Amino acid sequence: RILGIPWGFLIGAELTIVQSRISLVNKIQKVYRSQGVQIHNRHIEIIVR
Amino acid sequence: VDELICRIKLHEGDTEFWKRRFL
């Protein structure tokens, strides 16, 4: 409702995807870090991509 | 009535306008 053609969909998808990736990695790493399991964010970022 | 419709402006393809509204 704010932006026009290939800007409402383009920018809206970027915001949703960036927000989803940040929360998905945090949620996954919250589980392993509470159990003392250390995994590099590289591996989780590959799955979440 | 159609006179009042005539003031509504479409901005399709105007990147500079959408950049201003993005800011």
Whether the Cβ atoms of residue A44 and residue A29 lie closer than 8 Å to each other: yes
Residue A6 contacts B where some CB pair is shorter than 8 Å: no
CA B7 to chain centre: 10
Contacts of B17 (CB under 8 A, 6+ apart): B11
Tokens linked to B13: 């393809």
A4 contacts on B by Cβ (under 8 Å): 11-12, 14, 18
The approach used to solve this structure was: cryo-EM
Query: What tokens does B20 get?
Result: 């201003």
Resolution in A: 2.5
Beta carbons of B22 and A5 less than 8 Å apart: no
